[PDB]
Amino acid sequence: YHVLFDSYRDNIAGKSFQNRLCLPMPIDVVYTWVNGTDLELLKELQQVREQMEEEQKAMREILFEDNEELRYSLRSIERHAPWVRNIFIVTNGQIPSWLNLDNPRVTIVTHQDVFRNLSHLPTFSSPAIESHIHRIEGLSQKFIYLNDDVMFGKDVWPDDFYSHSKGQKVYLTWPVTFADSLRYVNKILNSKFGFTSRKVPAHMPHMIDRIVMQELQDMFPEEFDKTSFHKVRHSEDMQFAFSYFYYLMSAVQPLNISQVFDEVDTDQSGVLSDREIRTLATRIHELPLSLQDLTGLEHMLINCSKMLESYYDPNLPPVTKSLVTNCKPVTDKIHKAYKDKNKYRFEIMGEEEIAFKMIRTNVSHVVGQLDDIRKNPRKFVCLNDNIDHNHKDAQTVKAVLRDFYESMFPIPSQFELPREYRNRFLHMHELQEWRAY
Amino acid sequence: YHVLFDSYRDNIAGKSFQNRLCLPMPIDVVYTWVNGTDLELLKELQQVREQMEEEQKAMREILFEDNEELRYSLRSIERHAPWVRNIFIVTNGQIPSWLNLDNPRVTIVTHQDVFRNLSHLPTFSSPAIESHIHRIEGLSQKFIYLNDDVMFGKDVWPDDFYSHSKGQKVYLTWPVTFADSLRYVNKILNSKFGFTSRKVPAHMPHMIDRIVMQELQDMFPEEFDKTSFHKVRHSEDMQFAFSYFYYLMSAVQPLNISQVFDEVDTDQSGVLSDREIRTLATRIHELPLSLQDLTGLEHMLINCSKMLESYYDPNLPPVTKSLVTNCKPVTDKIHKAYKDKNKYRFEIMGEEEIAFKMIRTNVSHVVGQLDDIRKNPRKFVCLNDNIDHNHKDAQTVKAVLRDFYESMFPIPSQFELPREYRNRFLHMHELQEWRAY
Ligand SMILES: *[C@@H]1O[C@H](CO)[C@@H](O[C@@H]2O[C@H](CO)[C@@H](O)[C@H](O)[C@H]2NC(C)=O)[C@H](O)[C@H]1NC(C)=O
Ligand SMILES: *[C@@H]1O[C@H](CO)[C@@H](O[C@@H]2O[C@H](CO)[C@@H](O)[C@H](O)[C@H]2NC(C)=O)[C@H](O)[C@H]1NC(C)=O
Ligand SMILES: *[C@@H]1O[C@H](CO)[C@@H](O[C@@H]2O[C@H](CO)[C@@H](O)[C@H](O)[C@H]2NC(C)=O)[C@H](O)[C@H]1NC(C)=O
Ligand SMILES: *[C@@H]1O[C@H](CO)[C@@H](O[C@@H]2O[C@H](CO)[C@@H](O)[C@H](O)[C@H]2NC(C)=O)[C@H](O)[C@H]1NC(C)=O
Ligand SMILES: *[C@@H]1O[C@H](CO)[C@@H](O)[C@H](O)[C@H]1NC(C)=O
Ligand SMILES: *[C@@H]1O[C@H](CO)[C@@H](O)[C@H](O)[C@H]1NC(C)=O
Ligand SMILES: *[C@@H]1O[C@H](CO)[C@@H](O)[C@H](O)[C@H]1NC(C)=O
Ligand SMILES: *[C@@H]1O[C@H](CO)[C@@H](O)[C@H](O)[C@H]1NC(C)=O
Ligand SMILES: *[C@@H]1O[C@H](CO)[C@@H](O)[C@H](O)[C@H]1NC(C)=O
Ligand SMILES: *[C@@H]1O[C@H](CO)[C@@H](O)[C@H](O)[C@H]1NC(C)=O
Ligand SMILES: [Ca+2]
Ligand SMILES: [Ca+2]
């Protein structure tokens, strides 16, 4: 209503500060989903055969099952993060069988649109898909990247990914074919932004800015092409969390002398007075300010005018922006005092709202981990499903995981086709674990 | 426009989350201003005479100048915090000579309206005025209390006082007639909320919630009346920062068993399943969860039904809210596990954006402190004006302080009457300090 619109101009200034008070909206969610079908497995087999043939030629020169983790992740999106505008899922050409495509808020984005160089799209490698989400048409400027196995909890909010005051929120972990990529990107970033002891980010829903990601891609045009070229995840490729966040944390912005002059000129009258010249002297020199420093500043100023509301020294000309921006000694001292800032703001937190649990084929340990998740709910829950799949305790662990998923998120979502009539997944395996224990 | 209103319902849920995304608005600012006029000084003299007479009767039973710091503080309000809706100034009956009362966004609130017990209002004591700001009519639910000597800087935002996620922001200082009040309130709070090693808050613009302050007043009805009764700041009275913040940080909310049942019942169907009973067992007991604990939980549940979608134990009745909320052992274990939470959220930071500088009659030291303020601007700047006023270096320090004020905030505000024509305050005292140095 009009009163709500006119209530943001009810302040003393009379302006509207929606852009500084109402968070970045809209925010979208991007998923990467792959299915273990026969055709895709055959294509992978052909690609591996080609890889082996290439290795043989080089040496001659010398001479399956998913625990429907997308369904529950989408349910978590709808339940805990209901402020998401649209949901994008990137797939080869595959559409989930349970996905309700009639919903306008869910879209399947194939690899034709995502990839730029259409001689690359049979790509079968997660970093290559990860390279080009920011090129999705219709995607909001800030979007959250979900990895199809990470879920939500405790009713997350956009305040958990970005803040207008402290910028994006970076969640880091243990210090630094996937560890090789981390080492390679560490070397590449040390080459550009200098050597720094770096940690690696956590596996969790990552908020990504399209402008920042595009700037990162433009900064390394050749290297991101290697990531896209490789049709199997290589030792040398650029990641998603590590590359984006550390470019965000090490983006250097050159000093704007006009900004210094404007922040000092409180009158906004173009000319500086003795008080503003004195605050220049304070910000430039090191405290305490001896009058020698201020007299030297005025001396460098009177020199420059000769080469190119009354002040105490009668010989000092009116100090406009042109004098300070053209006087080399003053600009040199300004650069030496105002050294390089950071182009992007960021905030660093620990692993306190992140649940990365490792599921290895031990029903007692799996139940223990899931009970730990149940007792203390956490905002970001990730469950890596590396079950042996050839073991006496594979179906039992799958049943335990599905029971945890159905306990956390039981209600079917709006993105799911009307289904699961008489589905009745095995309800007796978890009872077998109960009876054995 | 309507698209802006309909853009908050563009999410997947279809609802509007303005109350969780756009910060608490509106926010007001409250000032306490006193003038050293002849009539007020005479009234103070009469009150002191009465105090001496009372002391004499008890033993018989045994037998001036302000550096216009409100002007510059209001200028700082307009420049650095332009999101304030209205500004309230509480005075005895005094109106500042420079205040533009024709502005609808500035109001003088006398002591008639502020005080509840009109036989108390000739009160001449800062805590007594401080007691009853939350009773100002038209005041917003969250307001900022300015002490007429604290200013702003670095373009403060409502994010610097309150966050929707971590609650109000508490700025604390060195651990604990004003120190006596701190000790007394520490004793009173230790009596109610138990002994705790407490720090004292900083002198800075304090954001105050009227509901929380009213709850604090109701919690100690007798003690806040002593604060209001005393017509001179006494050793025993309740402060503003210390009393409010520590009640905020030690407000205990009793456990809501219905909340536990609702957070566990993911189906929201009223009845719990084996998975939800198991997450109850995880949250109640201590990990790891032996099946003995879960069987005991079901045993306490089957007991209670006798005294008052199939589960593994055939004897367990449907577990609705009534069973768990009426079973004494289960509620006892829930209370023991879910011990007392805190009624209000809060966040703790250090003295990093607070400038409390002490001005004592040494021109070199005053200039050093003001240069330190100039070199590193800080969000909250407080300058205590305890000049000797009988010294060879009083006018010089006043001129230095006024020059700092006019350098920081030179532009006349909207709350100031059109004035200061040919005012020309002494521009030669600071030059005398320059020449002496
Ligand atoms: C993932 O791929 C599987 C095949 O691996 C597909 O499931 C098939 O669906 C068709 C219907 O179009 C059936 O005729 C086949 O019998 C199914 N095969 C199997 C092995 O179940 C489907 O495209 C995808 N399934 C899921 C659950 O994502
Ligand atoms: C599966 O996990 C359980 C723990 O959940 C393992 O039990 C451990 O057994 C060793 C000795 O066998 C003990 O020293 C540990 O204290 C046990 N753990 C706990 C938490 O008590 C069990 O060994 C694991 N089984 C396999 C095959 O790895
Ligand atoms: C504070 O009180 C002073 C008096 O201490 C007042 O200034 C007086 O203003 C009247 C005009 O109504 C003049 O006739 C007097 O000569 C002034 N006295 C002095 C000592 O200046 C005024 O009410 C207040 N002044 C300020 C600056 O707040
Ligand atoms: C006023 O402050 C200055 C510092 O701003 C004082 O100068 C100090 O003098 C003592 C000895 O007299 C030295 O040990 C200190 O190192 C000086 N301070 C600095 C920062 O160099 C001066 O003494 C003060 N004057 C009075 C009267 O208190
Ligand atoms: C990418 O496209 C360019 C021209 O658009 C082409 O020369 C190059 O070979 C492509 N990269 C491949 C096919 O890996
Ligand atoms: C930064 O510098 C550019 C050109 O040098 C100028 O257009 C811009 O206004 C400056 N930013 C400010 C003054 O905030
Ligand atoms: C420039 O200023 C310095 C003082 O910092 C002075 O010594 C020098 O003589 C000036 N330059 C000229 C050409 O006079
Ligand atoms: C406060 O008001 C009550 C009645 O409203 C009165 O009895 C009491 O004396 C008052 N307190 C004073 C005058 O200090
Ligand atoms: C807290 O308890 C009260 C009554 O005991 C109830 O009305 C309210 O809904 C509960 N809060 C919840 C369920 O969030
Ligand atoms: C209540 O349950 C306990 C098991 O925790 C059991 O020992 C006891 O017999 C039950 N009460 C009755 C009256 O049977
Ligand atoms: Ca100026
Ligand atoms: Ca249920």
GROMACS .gro file of N, CA, C and O in nm, chain A residues 8 10-13 17 20-22 77 81-85 105 157 159 266-267 275 278-279 282-283 285 287 290-291 298 312 367 371-372 374-375 403 407 410-411 414-415 434-435 437, chain B residues 8 10-13 17 20-22 82-85 105 157 159 266-267 275 278-279 282-283 285 287 289-291 298 312 367 371-372 374-375 403 407 410-411 414-415 431 434-435 437:
model
  360
    8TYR      N    1   0.920   0.461   0.414
    8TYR     CA    2   1.065   0.462   0.401
    8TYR      C    3   1.120   0.601   0.373
    8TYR      O    4   1.242   0.620   0.377
   10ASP      N    5   0.997   0.857   0.559
   10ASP     CA    6   0.952   0.923   0.681
   10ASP      C    7   1.068   0.965   0.770
   10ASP      O    8   1.045   1.013   0.882
   11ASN      N    9   1.191   0.946   0.724
   11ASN     CA   10   1.308   0.982   0.802
   11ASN      C   11   1.335   1.133   0.794
   11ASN      O   12   1.263   1.208   0.728
   12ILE      N   13   1.441   1.176   0.863
   12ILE     CA   14   1.473   1.318   0.867
   12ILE      C   15   1.522   1.367   0.731
   12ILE      O   16   1.489   1.477   0.688
   13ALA      N   17   1.602   1.285   0.662
   13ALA     CA   18   1.655   1.325   0.532
   13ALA      C   19   1.544   1.341   0.429
   13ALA      O   20   1.547   1.432   0.347
   17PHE      N   21   1.588   0.446   0.193
   17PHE     CA   22   1.705   0.362   0.214
   17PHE      C   23   1.669   0.214   0.209
   17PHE      O   24   1.714   0.134   0.291
   20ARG      N   25   1.969  -0.026   0.145
   20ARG     CA   26   2.063  -0.042   0.255
   20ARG      C   27   2.000  -0.106   0.378
   20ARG      O   28   2.070  -0.131   0.477
   21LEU      N   29   1.870  -0.135   0.375
   21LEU     CA   30   1.799  -0.185   0.491
   21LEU      C   31   1.725  -0.316   0.469
   21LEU      O   32   1.695  -0.385   0.567
   22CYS      N   33   1.696  -0.354   0.345
   22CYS     CA   34   1.611  -0.470   0.315
   22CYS      C   35   1.684  -0.586   0.248
   22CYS      O   36   1.620  -0.670   0.183
   77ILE      N   37   1.470  -2.672   0.110
   77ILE     CA   38   1.460  -2.538   0.052
   77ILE      C   39   1.324  -2.478   0.081
   77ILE      O   40   1.312  -2.363   0.124
   81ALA      N   41   1.412  -2.236   0.399
   81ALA     CA   42   1.450  -2.116   0.325
   81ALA      C   43   1.341  -2.081   0.224
   81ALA      O   44   1.361  -2.093   0.103
   82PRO      N   45   1.225  -2.037   0.271
   82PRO     CA   46   1.113  -2.009   0.181
   82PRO      C   47   1.118  -1.872   0.114
   82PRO      O   48   1.017  -1.830   0.057
   83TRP      N   49   1.230  -1.802   0.120
   83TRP     CA   50   1.245  -1.670   0.058
   83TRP      C   51   1.313  -1.677  -0.078
   83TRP      O   52   1.348  -1.572  -0.133
   84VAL      N   53   1.331  -1.796  -0.132
   84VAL     CA   54   1.398  -1.813  -0.261
   84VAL      C   55   1.300  -1.786  -0.374
   84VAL      O   56   1.187  -1.837  -0.373
   85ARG      N   57   1.342  -1.706  -0.471
   85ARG     CA   58   1.253  -1.669  -0.581
   85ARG      C   59   1.236  -1.784  -0.680
   85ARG      O   60   1.124  -1.832  -0.702
  105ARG      N   61   0.841  -2.191  -1.075
  105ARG     CA   62   0.953  -2.155  -0.991
  105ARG      C   63   1.063  -2.260  -0.991
  105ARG      O   64   1.159  -2.249  -0.913
  157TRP      N   65   1.840  -1.791   0.684
  157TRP     CA   66   1.794  -1.663   0.635
  157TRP      C   67   1.905  -1.603   0.549
  157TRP      O   68   2.021  -1.643   0.560
  159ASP      N   69   2.051  -1.343   0.594
  159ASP     CA   70   2.150  -1.290   0.687
  159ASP      C   71   2.262  -1.388   0.715
  159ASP      O   72   2.366  -1.347   0.768
  266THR      N   73   3.476   1.840   0.415
  266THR     CA   74   3.345   1.826   0.478
  266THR      C   75   3.246   1.928   0.425
  266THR      O   76   3.126   1.901   0.417
  267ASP      N   77   3.294   2.047   0.389
  267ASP     CA   78   3.206   2.150   0.335
  267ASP      C   79   3.145   2.109   0.202
  267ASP      O   80   3.037   2.157   0.165
  275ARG      N   81   4.125   2.364   0.890
  275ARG     CA   82   4.083   2.244   0.963
  275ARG      C   83   4.090   2.120   0.875
  275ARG      O   84   4.137   2.014   0.919
  278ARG      N   85   4.443   2.032   0.811
  278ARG     CA   86   4.497   1.966   0.929
  278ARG      C   87   4.452   1.821   0.941
  278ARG      O   88   4.531   1.736   0.983
  279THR      N   89   4.327   1.790   0.905
  279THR     CA   90   4.288   1.649   0.909
  279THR      C   91   4.356   1.570   0.797
  279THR      O   92   4.388   1.452   0.818
  282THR      N   93   4.687   1.495   0.960
  282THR     CA   94   4.674   1.387   1.058
  282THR      C   95   4.665   1.251   0.990
  282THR      O   96   4.730   1.155   1.031
  283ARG      N   97   4.583   1.241   0.884
  283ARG     CA   98   4.565   1.112   0.818
  283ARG      C   99   4.688   1.071   0.739
  283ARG      O  100   4.711   0.951   0.717
  285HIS      N  101   5.039   1.184   0.796
  285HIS     CA  102   5.155   1.162   0.880
  285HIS      C  103   5.122   1.064   0.993
  285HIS      O  104   5.012   1.011   1.003
  287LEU      N  105   5.099   1.011   1.407
  287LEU     CA  106   5.081   1.087   1.529
  287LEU      C  107   5.198   1.063   1.625
  287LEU      O  108   5.254   0.953   1.629
  290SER      N  109   5.367   1.691   1.458
  290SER     CA  110   5.449   1.810   1.478
  290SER      C  111   5.415   1.914   1.373
  290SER      O  112   5.381   1.882   1.259
  291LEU      N  113   5.424   2.042   1.412
  291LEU     CA  114   5.392   2.150   1.319
  291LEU      C  115   5.485   2.148   1.199
  291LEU      O  116   5.452   2.207   1.095
  298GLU      N  117   5.198   2.231   0.367
  298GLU     CA  118   5.168   2.357   0.300
  298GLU      C  119   5.281   2.399   0.207
  298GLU      O  120   5.256   2.465   0.106
  312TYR      N  121   4.647   3.052   0.757
  312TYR     CA  122   4.746   3.117   0.842
  312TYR      C  123   4.867   3.164   0.762
  312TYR      O  124   4.914   3.276   0.780
  367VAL      N  125   2.423  -4.457   1.250
  367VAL     CA  126   2.317  -4.422   1.345
  367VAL      C  127   2.369  -4.322   1.447
  367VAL      O  128   2.297  -4.229   1.486
  371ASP      N  129   2.209  -3.956   1.489
  371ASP     CA  130   2.161  -3.913   1.620
  371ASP      C  131   2.226  -3.783   1.663
  371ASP      O  132   2.162  -3.698   1.725
  372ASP      N  133   2.356  -3.768   1.635
  372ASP     CA  134   2.423  -3.642   1.664
  372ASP      C  135   2.359  -3.527   1.586
  372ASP      O  136   2.338  -3.418   1.640
  374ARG      N  137   2.047  -3.522   1.484
  374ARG     CA  138   1.914  -3.503   1.540
  374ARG      C  139   1.918  -3.423   1.670
  374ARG      O  140   1.836  -3.333   1.691
  375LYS      N  141   2.013  -3.455   1.758
  375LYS     CA  142   2.017  -3.391   1.889
  375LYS      C  143   2.047  -3.242   1.878
  375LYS      O  144   1.985  -3.161   1.947
  403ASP      N  145   1.542  -4.296   0.639
  403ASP     CA  146   1.461  -4.267   0.757
  403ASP      C  147   1.498  -4.134   0.819
  403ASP      O  148   1.410  -4.059   0.862
  407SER      N  149   1.242  -3.827   0.839
  407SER     CA  150   1.215  -3.766   0.968
  407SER      C  151   1.234  -3.616   0.963
  407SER      O  152   1.153  -3.540   1.018
  410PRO      N  153   0.943  -3.463   0.603
  410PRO     CA  154   0.843  -3.562   0.561
  410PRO      C  155   0.741  -3.513   0.460
  410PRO      O  156   0.691  -3.595   0.382
  411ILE      N  157   0.710  -3.384   0.457
  411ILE     CA  158   0.599  -3.330   0.379
  411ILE      C  159   0.646  -3.316   0.234
  411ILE      O  160   0.750  -3.253   0.211
  414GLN      N  161   0.637  -2.861  -0.318
  414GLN     CA  162   0.563  -2.814  -0.434
  414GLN      C  163   0.632  -2.848  -0.566
  414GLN      O  164   0.568  -2.840  -0.671
  415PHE      N  165   0.760  -2.884  -0.561
  415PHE     CA  166   0.837  -2.917  -0.680
  415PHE      C  167   0.832  -3.066  -0.713
  415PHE      O  168   0.903  -3.111  -0.804
  434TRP      N  169   1.742  -5.204   1.483
  434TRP     CA  170   1.693  -5.195   1.620
  434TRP      C  171   1.708  -5.328   1.693
  434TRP      O  172   1.764  -5.334   1.803
  435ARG      N  173   1.661  -5.437   1.632
  435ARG     CA  174   1.666  -5.569   1.693
  435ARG      C  175   1.809  -5.620   1.710
  435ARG      O  176   1.837  -5.686   1.810
  437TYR      N  177   2.063  -5.432   1.765
  437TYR     CA  178   2.119  -5.350   1.872
  437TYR      C  179   2.039  -5.367   2.001
  437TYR      O  180   2.096  -5.389   2.108
  445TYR      N  181   0.803  -0.888  -0.272
  445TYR     CA  182   0.831  -0.961  -0.150
  445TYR      C  183   0.750  -1.089  -0.138
  445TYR      O  184   0.776  -1.169  -0.048
  447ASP      N  185   0.731  -1.285  -0.415
  447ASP     CA  186   0.782  -1.354  -0.533
  447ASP      C  187   0.863  -1.477  -0.497
  447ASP      O  188   0.921  -1.540  -0.586
  448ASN      N  189   0.869  -1.513  -0.370
  448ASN     CA  190   0.944  -1.630  -0.326
  448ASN      C  191   0.864  -1.758  -0.351
  448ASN      O  192   0.752  -1.756  -0.401
  449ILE      N  193   0.925  -1.871  -0.314
  449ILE     CA  194   0.862  -2.000  -0.338
  449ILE      C  195   0.740  -2.018  -0.248
  449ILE      O  196   0.637  -2.072  -0.291
  450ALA      N  197   0.750  -1.974  -0.123
  450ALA     CA  198   0.638  -1.989  -0.030
  450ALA      C  199   0.517  -1.908  -0.074
  450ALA      O  200   0.403  -1.953  -0.062
  454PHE      N  201   0.813  -1.156   0.378
  454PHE     CA  202   0.906  -1.159   0.490
  454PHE      C  203   0.971  -1.023   0.513
  454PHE      O  204   1.092  -1.013   0.537
  457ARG      N  205   1.128  -0.975   0.867
  457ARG     CA  206   1.250  -1.049   0.893
  457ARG      C  207   1.366  -1.007   0.804
  457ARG      O  208   1.477  -1.057   0.820
  458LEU      N  209   1.343  -0.914   0.711
  458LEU     CA  210   1.445  -0.876   0.614
  458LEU      C  211   1.477  -0.728   0.609
  458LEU      O  212   1.584  -0.691   0.560
  459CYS      N  213   1.389  -0.641   0.660
  459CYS     CA  214   1.404  -0.496   0.645
  459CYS      C  215   1.432  -0.422   0.775
  459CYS      O  216   1.406  -0.301   0.784
  519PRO      N  217   2.096   0.943   0.882
  519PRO     CA  218   1.978   1.011   0.827
  519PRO      C  219   1.853   0.924   0.818
  519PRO      O  220   1.758   0.965   0.751
  520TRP      N  221   1.851   0.808   0.882
  520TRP     CA  222   1.736   0.719   0.879
  520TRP      C  223   1.648   0.733   1.003
  520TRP      O  224   1.558   0.652   1.023
  521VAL      N  225   1.672   0.835   1.085
  521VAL     CA  226   1.596   0.856   1.208
  521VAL      C  227   1.465   0.925   1.175
  521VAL      O  228   1.462   1.024   1.101
  522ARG      N  229   1.355   0.873   1.230
  522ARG     CA  230   1.223   0.928   1.200
  522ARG      C  231   1.200   1.060   1.272
  522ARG      O  232   1.178   1.164   1.209
  542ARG      N  233   0.992   1.719   1.285
  542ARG     CA  234   1.071   1.603   1.322
  542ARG      C  235   1.156   1.627   1.446
  542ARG      O  236   1.239   1.541   1.481
  594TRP      N  237   2.463   0.287   1.092
  594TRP     CA  238   2.343   0.228   1.036
  594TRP      C  239   2.272   0.151   1.146
  594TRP      O  240   2.333   0.117   1.248
  596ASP      N  241   2.210  -0.143   1.155
  596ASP     CA  242   2.282  -0.269   1.171
  596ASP      C  243   2.387  -0.261   1.281
  596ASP      O  244   2.436  -0.366   1.324
  703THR      N  245   0.760  -3.316   1.319
  703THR     CA  246   0.783  -3.257   1.188
  703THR      C  247   0.659  -3.266   1.099
  703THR      O  248   0.635  -3.179   1.016
  704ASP      N  249   0.580  -3.373   1.116
  704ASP     CA  250   0.458  -3.388   1.037
  704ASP      C  251   0.357  -3.279   1.067
  704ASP      O  252   0.273  -3.246   0.982
  712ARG      N  253   1.038  -4.228   1.432
  712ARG     CA  254   1.149  -4.137   1.403
  712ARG      C  255   1.147  -4.015   1.493
  712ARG      O  256   1.251  -3.972   1.545
  715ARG      N  257   1.236  -4.111   1.838
  715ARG     CA  258   1.381  -4.129   1.845
  715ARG      C  259   1.455  -3.996   1.852
  715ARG      O  260   1.555  -3.986   1.923
  716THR      N  261   1.409  -3.894   1.780
  716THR     CA  262   1.476  -3.765   1.794
  716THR      C  263   1.447  -3.701   1.930
  716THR      O  264   1.535  -3.634   1.985
  719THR      N  265   1.707  -3.873   2.141
  719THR     CA  266   1.839  -3.815   2.119
  719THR      C  267   1.854  -3.682   2.191
  719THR      O  268   1.956  -3.656   2.255
  720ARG      N  269   1.752  -3.595   2.180
  720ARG     CA  270   1.763  -3.463   2.241
  720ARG      C  271   1.754  -3.470   2.393
  720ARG      O  272   1.806  -3.381   2.462
  722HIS      N  273   1.835  -3.763   2.609
  722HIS     CA  274   1.945  -3.836   2.669
  722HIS      C  275   2.079  -3.780   2.619
  722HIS      O  276   2.085  -3.683   2.544
  724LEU      N  277   2.434  -3.865   2.416
  724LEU     CA  278   2.487  -3.956   2.316
  724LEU      C  279   2.608  -4.032   2.371
  724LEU      O  280   2.685  -3.978   2.451
  726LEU      N  281   2.314  -4.302   2.210
  726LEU     CA  282   2.182  -4.345   2.256
  726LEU      C  283   2.177  -4.497   2.258
  726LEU      O  284   2.166  -4.562   2.154
  727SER      N  285   2.186  -4.554   2.378
  727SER     CA  286   2.161  -4.697   2.394
  727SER      C  287   2.012  -4.725   2.383
  727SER      O  288   1.928  -4.643   2.423
  728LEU      N  289   1.978  -4.842   2.328
  728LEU     CA  290   1.838  -4.878   2.312
  728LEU      C  291   1.767  -4.885   2.446
  728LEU      O  292   1.643  -4.879   2.451
  735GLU      N  293   0.977  -4.518   2.595
  735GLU     CA  294   0.848  -4.578   2.562
  735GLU      C  295   0.781  -4.639   2.685
  735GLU      O  296   0.658  -4.643   2.692
  749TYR      N  297   0.707  -4.996   1.686
  749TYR     CA  298   0.768  -5.128   1.701
  749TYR      C  299   0.711  -5.201   1.822
  749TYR      O  300   0.678  -5.320   1.814
  804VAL      N  301   4.489   1.862   2.179
  804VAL     CA  302   4.518   1.859   2.036
  804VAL      C  303   4.561   1.719   1.993
  804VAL      O  304   4.523   1.672   1.885
  808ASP      N  305   4.357   1.505   1.721
  808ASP     CA  306   4.427   1.453   1.603
  808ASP      C  307   4.411   1.303   1.591
  808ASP      O  308   4.397   1.250   1.481
  809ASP      N  309   4.415   1.232   1.704
  809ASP     CA  310   4.389   1.088   1.701
  809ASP      C  311   4.248   1.060   1.650
  809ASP      O  312   4.228   0.968   1.570
  811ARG      N  313   4.080   1.255   1.448
  811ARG     CA  314   4.079   1.292   1.306
  811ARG      C  315   4.142   1.183   1.220
  811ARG      O  316   4.089   1.150   1.113
  812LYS      N  317   4.255   1.129   1.263
  812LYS     CA  318   4.328   1.033   1.181
  812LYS      C  319   4.248   0.905   1.160
  812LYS      O  320   4.244   0.851   1.049
  840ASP      N  321   3.675   2.409   1.716
  840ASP     CA  322   3.733   2.390   1.583
  840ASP      C  323   3.722   2.246   1.538
  840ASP      O  324   3.693   2.220   1.421
  844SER      N  325   3.507   2.136   1.219
  844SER     CA  326   3.571   2.060   1.113
  844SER      C  327   3.492   1.934   1.081
  844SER      O  328   3.474   1.900   0.963
  847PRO      N  329   3.043   2.091   0.971
  847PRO     CA  330   3.035   2.235   0.945
  847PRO      C  331   2.900   2.285   0.897
  847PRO      O  332   2.868   2.402   0.922
  848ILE      N  333   2.822   2.201   0.830
  848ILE     CA  334   2.701   2.245   0.761
  848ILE      C  335   2.589   2.258   0.865
  848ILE      O  336   2.565   2.161   0.939
  851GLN      N  337   1.901   2.094   0.976
  851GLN     CA  338   1.763   2.136   0.957
  851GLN      C  339   1.694   2.170   1.088
  851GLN      O  340   1.588   2.233   1.086
  852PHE      N  341   1.751   2.129   1.201
  852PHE     CA  342   1.694   2.153   1.333
  852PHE      C  343   1.745   2.283   1.395
  852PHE      O  344   1.715   2.311   1.512
  868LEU      N  345   4.514   2.960   1.647
  868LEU     CA  346   4.639   3.011   1.591
  868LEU      C  347   4.739   3.048   1.699
  868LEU      O  348   4.860   3.038   1.677
  871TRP      N  349   4.890   2.726   1.768
  871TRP     CA  350   4.982   2.699   1.658
  871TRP      C  351   5.115   2.770   1.679
  871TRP      O  352   5.221   2.708   1.672
  872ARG      N  353   5.111   2.900   1.708
  872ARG     CA  354   5.231   2.980   1.727
  872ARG      C  355   5.311   2.938   1.850
  872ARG      O  356   5.434   2.941   1.846
  874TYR      N  357   5.323   2.638   1.964
  874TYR     CA  358   5.381   2.509   1.929
  874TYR      C  359   5.472   2.521   1.808
  874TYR      O  360   5.585   2.472   1.808
   0.00000   0.00000   0.00000
